[PDB]
Amino acid sequence: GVEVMIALDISNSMLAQDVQPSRLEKAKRLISKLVDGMENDKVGMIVFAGDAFTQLPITSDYISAKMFLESISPSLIKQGTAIGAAINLAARSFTPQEGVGRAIVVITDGENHEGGAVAAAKSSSSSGIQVNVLGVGLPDGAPIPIEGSNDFRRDREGNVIVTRLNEAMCQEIAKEGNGIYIRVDNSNSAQKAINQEINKM
Ligand SMILES: [Ca+2]
């Protein structure tokens, strides 16, 4: 068995709907598939935007993990995007259990704002903790819809924000984390590939 810490981006850009039904909802279904495909592993979950928090400590209760997905609330996280902080928190969140594989799975559009994500991945992998990245979204660009509104999120100048999958950043994080990068399209297929990479730990 391997210990797997999910780090899920719940920042505002994840509400973009360039992938159906949104980046966040696609990510939630991927996590659900991922845990339903576990047998011997343990799983935990961190959510992050401007800061990172552990919702679910590492556990054998896969079903509990699925339940946390239903209550995810981007309305209730500091705003922003802090992948490095999430990796750092994840790296310190595994059990001391002797000789067990440890893997971090970051799920994000990679629109990182802060620096240090690559350095965090390097630190993690140096210590033996693999960092994988599942990129959700498209590189083209989509706006961010506001629930109960016909409008989209705007910047300080009043223009519509366009958010894009930052593939280069996600790929570099996975590389330095000794892990894999997958651009998520078929969530069931992405799930198999990540389980396949994890099952070498
Ligand atoms: Ca973001």
Strand partners, 145: 152
Method: X-ray
3-state secondary structure 113-135: CCCCHHHHHHHHHHCCCEEEEEE
Q: Is 109 part of any known ligand binding site?
A: yes
Answer yes or no: is 81 a known binding residue.
yes
44 and 54 Cβ atoms separated by less than 8 Å: yes
As given in the structure block, the two tokens for residue 127 are 């210590």
Q: How far is the CA of 112 from the centre of ligand 1 (A)?
A: 7
DSSP alpha helices (H): ranges in the chain? 23-36, 62-70, 83-91, 117-126, 167-176, 187-198
Are 52 and 114 in contact by the 8 Å Cβ rule? The answer is no
User: Is 189 known as a binding-site position?
Assistant: no
For residue 11, the CA-to-ligand 1 centroid distance in Å is 5
Angle at 52 between CA 68 and CA 125, to 5 degrees: 105
Q: Is 13 annotated as a binding residue?
A: yes
Task: Enter the tokens of residue 139.
Answer: 């590189």
What is the CA(1)–ligand 1 centre distance, in A? 32
Neighbour count for residue 153 (Cβ, 10 Å): 17
Resolution rounded to one decimal, in angstroms: 1.5
Residue 57 CB partners (closer than 8 Å, separation 6+): 44, 93
Closest among 6, 91, 16, 15 to 48, alpha carbons compared? 6
Distances in whole angstroms, Cα of residue 106 to Cα of each of 42, 74, 81, 115, 143: 16, 17, 12, 16, 22
Residues composing the chain: 201
Q: How far apart are CA 128 and CA 125, in angstroms?
A: 5
Q: Buried b / exposed e across 106-130, counting CB within 10 Å, b at 16+?
A: bbbbbbbeeebbbebbbbbbeeebb
CA of 23 to the centre of ligand 1 (A): 10
Compute, in angstroms, the gap from residue 200 CA to the centroid of ligand 1. Answer: 30
Distance separating alpha carbons of residues 9 and 136, to the nearest angstrom: 10
CATH of domain 1-200: 3.40.50.410
**Count of other CB atoms within 10 angstroms of residue 54:** 18
